[PDB]
């Protein structure tokens, strides 16, 4: 069933739906989920959601199409900016706490880290390490303080870092970056002070093959390095590190088989997510048993902010790639995702399952219908529809789950009833149609399943009692509430019920009772000058009347013959009999050979 975390997320989904269906302007998913890390005690989920929130606060699609946005350059600039800022504030908190101001914070961390070195020290601390680590926190004004103090062994770095903090894309003049590269490989690369090389690297986008394992030991640090290093400008084509190349690099090294095997999923996920690719992150994180719900709800959050490149066609993969994108990212088969998440607790606690189901509403299907409907129509039938799912009629509809977030339920009811109808679960669909206030459909459906049993004898362990009570309750509700159905179907229904009672009395053994019943039906000959109209009466009789006329006529003939043998009146009786013969003598409708055989046999025998 559910876990406390699962039911917690669930309740929150309830709340978001009660928001969107009420017409309130509310905080979107990401906000609720963010706060839903301190309602229950945790440590990591909080961090994941922090990352998600910070990474989704972007200018949302400065275009008209999601693909355009998620492949435009400026969009990726926004992504990398948000990402960098998150990493940097993260590391800032990490040090600021683990050390137990900023300018001396980094200083103390250096002192509690490490006690050839280029360009000496200031205040007794090596300048290059100071510069690097104080940039690492995303604070340049401290680096500005340093380069104001430390200014006597540089002066190219001075204006370098100046025009670094002058363009908001952190890009220098082209020739500036080029002379930085030229000085780097010519006097800087071959040095024994790595830190200086790392600083010149990030500040000048140099040597995109270096990883600096010594100073950026941590995977998070590695992300910092490469993202601080990536470039969208085209300066040389040999140190141009393209963000798509980095996404491919990470997808290579991290994930696609390495995710589940390394038993540190949260961190891997933050990696795969900070790199401007959401789909392939959730798709992995969704697989591990520990972090199913967190992945699924990150996906829902993303979808609600319309930040998702979902699968347009229908396939059998969760994460898919359609060989048309420039690079894009693997598309996420959103529908299959919701399905393969709900199916765990769908057939046990469907109340909450229906809640997730709602989100697929505007996502069409193969047939041309909302997938949401073709989803409910399975849950509600294979989990034995209750009133809590739809409701119970009397003359008044009981509110159900589907009511609480959708108006005009009659739509959903008609749909699911038709679906269960095609499925061959007919009786249940009759009940549903009745819960929908649609008389013609209820009655036409009951017609079929009523037709064949109307002459089957009492037969203990049958359906007759059940369907009889069903149709009787139908009659009560409809004739009492003044509900009237289509004439040619209402008529056939009431004829079928009167015939039910007639045959009950017949089987029971009341001759004259059933006889006046069959008289007052005008289905069979009563006078030799009316049989010509009897022949005209049908050609409007549906298959129902056909599928029993045989036994109707047979039973009637039985009544007549019993009266005759048990009996002047026999003239009238046998005249009615030969009229019946003439009737059967010209029926195009259903019969059997033995039907007319017994008919004419009893006829000539009573003669």
């Amino acid at each position: 069933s559910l876990d406390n975390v699962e039911m917690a997320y669930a309740r929150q989904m309830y709340m978001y739906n009660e928001k969107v269906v009420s017409g309130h302007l509310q905080p979107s998913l990401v906000d609720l989920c963010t706060e839903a890390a301190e309602r229950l005690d945790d440590k990591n989920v909080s961090d994941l959601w922090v990352m998600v929130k910070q990474m989704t606060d972007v200018p949302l699609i400065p275009a008209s199409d999601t693909l355009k946005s998620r492949c435009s350059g400026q969009m990726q600039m926004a992504f990398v900016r948000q990402a960098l800022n998150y990493l940097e504030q993260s590391y800032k908190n990490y040090t600021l706490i683990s050390v137990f101001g900023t300018y001396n914070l980094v200083r103390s961390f250096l002192n509690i880290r490490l006690p050839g070195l280029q360009d000496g020290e200031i205040e007794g601390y090596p300048v290059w390490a100071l510069i690097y680590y104080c940039m690492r926190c995303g604070d340049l004004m401290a680096a500005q303080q340093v380069v104001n103090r430390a200014q006597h062994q540089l002066g190219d770095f001075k204006n370098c870092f100046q025009e670094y903090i002058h363009n908001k894309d952190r890009r220098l003049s082209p020739t500036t970056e080029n002379k930085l590269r030229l000085h780097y490989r010519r006097a800087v690369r071959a040095s024994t002070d790595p830190y200086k090389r790392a600083v010149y690297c990030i500040i000048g986008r140099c040597d995109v093959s270096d990883n600096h394992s010594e100073v950026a030991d941590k995977t998070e640090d590695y992300l910092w390095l490469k993202l601080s290093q990536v470039c969208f400008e085209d300066s040389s084509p040999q140190d141009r590190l393209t963000l798509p190349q980095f996404q491919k690099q990470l997808f290579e090294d991290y994930g696609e088989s390495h995710f589940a095997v390394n038993q540190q999923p949260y961190l891997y996920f933050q990696v795969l997510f900070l790199t401007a690719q959401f789909e392939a992150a959730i798709a992995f994180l969704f697989r591990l048993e520990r972090t199913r719900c967190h992945a699924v709800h990150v996906a829902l959050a993303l979808f609600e902010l319309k930040l998702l490149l979902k699968s347009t066609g229908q396939s059998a993969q969760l994460l898919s790639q359609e060989p048309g994108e420039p690079q894009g990212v693997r598309r996420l088969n959103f529908i299959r995702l919701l399905m393969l998440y709900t199916r765990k607790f769908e057939p046990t606690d469907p109340r909450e399952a229906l809640q997730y189901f709602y989100f697929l509403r505007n996502e069409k299907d193969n047939q041309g219908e909302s997938m949401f409907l073709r989803c409910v129509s399975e849950l509600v039938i294979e989990s034995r529809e209750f009133d809590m799912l739809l409701g119970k009629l009397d003359g008044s509809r009981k509110p159900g789950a589907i009511d609480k977030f959708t108006r005009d339920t009659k739509t959903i009811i008609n749909k699911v009833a038709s679906v269960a109808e095609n499925k061959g679960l007919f009786e249940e669909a009759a009940k549903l149609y009745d819960l929908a206030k649609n008389p013609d459909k209820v009655l036409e459906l009951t017609n079929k399943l009523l037709s064949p049993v109307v002459s089957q004898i009492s037969a203990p362990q049958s359906n007759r009692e059940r369907l009889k009570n069903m149709a009787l309750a139908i009659a009560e509700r409809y004739k009492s509430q003044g509900v009237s159905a289509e004439k040619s179907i209402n008529s056939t229904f009431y004829l079928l019920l009167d015939l039910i009672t007639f045959f009950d009395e017949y089987h029971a053994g009341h001759i004259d009772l059933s006889f006046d019943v069959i008289e007052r039906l005008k289905l069979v000959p009563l006078s030799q000058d009316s049989v010509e109209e009897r022949v005209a009466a049908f050609r409007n009789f549906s298959d129902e009347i056909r599928h029993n006329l045989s036994e109707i006529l047979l039973a009637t003939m039985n009544i007549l013959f019993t009266q005759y043998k048990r009996l002047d009146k026999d003239s009238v009786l046998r005249s009615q009999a030969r009229a019946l013969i003439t009737f059967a003598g010209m029926i195009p409708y259903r019969m059997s050979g033995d039907t007319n055989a017994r008919l004419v046999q009893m006829e000539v025998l009573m003669n």
Epitope: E256, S257, A283, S320, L340
Partner: nanobody, 125 residues
Framework: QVQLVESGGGVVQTGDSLMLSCTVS????????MGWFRQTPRKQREFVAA????????IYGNSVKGRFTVSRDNAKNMVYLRMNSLKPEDTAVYFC??????????????????WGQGTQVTVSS
């Protein structure tokens, strides 16, 4: 329909080593991943092992870490689970299912679509 045969079970004794096999019936397993689960009366289903589509690396369950081995032979279209140092609880029917989702190495039952029928095993201590 692409069915499966999940065979190699039987009754064995404690501390022995059992080789459970599975053979695909009607497809080429080079895109899919493979998974060996077990059905006990303890639960309805649990996880044992799952191997990716490259035949290189696999995830082992919550308790069985460091006692089993799994492999897939694309050239033989077979799935192999060889065990060591069994436990009384392992009297169970082991299933071998297929992963198409084309991502990761799932460890939850529902993620897989097709199945064989199972191979029953019974350890007698």
């Amino acid at each position: 329909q692409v069915q499966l045969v999940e065979s190699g079970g039987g009754v064995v004794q404690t501390g022995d080593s059992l080789m459970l096999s599975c053979t695909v019936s009607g497809h080429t397993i080079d895109n899919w991943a493979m998974g060996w689960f077990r059905q006990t009366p303890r639960k309805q289903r649990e996880f044992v092992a799952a191997i990716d589509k490259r035949g290189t690396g696999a995830i082992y369950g919550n308790s069985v870490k460091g006692r089993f081995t799994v492999s897939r032979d694309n050239a033989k279209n077979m799935v192999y689970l060889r065990m060591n140092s069994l436990k009384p609880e392992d009297t169970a029917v082991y299933f071998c299912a297929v992963d198409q989702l084309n991502a990761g190495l799932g460890d939850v039952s529902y993620d897989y679509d097709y199945w064989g029928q199972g191979t029953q095993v019974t350890v007698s201590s």
